[PDB]
Amino acid sequence: HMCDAFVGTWKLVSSENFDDYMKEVGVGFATRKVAGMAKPNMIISVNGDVITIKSESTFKNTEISFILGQEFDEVTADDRKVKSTITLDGGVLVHVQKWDGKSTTIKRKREDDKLVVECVMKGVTSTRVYERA
Ligand SMILES: CC(C)[C@H](Sc1cc(Cl)c(Cl)cc1Cl)C(=O)O
């Protein structure tokens, strides 16, 4: 029951600072424009110890499956090859991605009826809000 409050189907309803976050990450112009237009559905499920997070959008469909605390290799939607670790810290799902000596952190937390996503790359933060679909 570790992630119970995250499980479900969620739809993007707002975004702030995402273009600048993507610039800091190193995403190129065309991908930023098209990805920034995306309105993904995020589908979170749990089966035993395995958490799956799917994202579906007109830009890309992705899927990750993982066990908390256990590193995995990930090709991200913007085509970075990263090493990812996802943990639960005080009820917040914390996703760290490492590649090319760089690091970014994506945190997901339940706040009221929303799932709030905070993405940080150096000093640049973006906040994305999802609601139940
Ligand atoms: C928190 C943000 C870095 C991402 S952005 C994003 C992620 C995926 Cl997996 C797909 Cl298919 C499309 C976009 Cl645009 C988010 O999950 O909202």
Ligand SMILES: CC(C)[C@H](Sc1cc(Cl)c(Cl)cc1Cl)C(=O)O
């Ligand atoms: C959301 C995670 C699961 C990663 S992170 C990510 C995704 C996109 Cl599309 C952009 Cl533009 C920037 C970042 Cl940092 C992903 O899969 O893309």
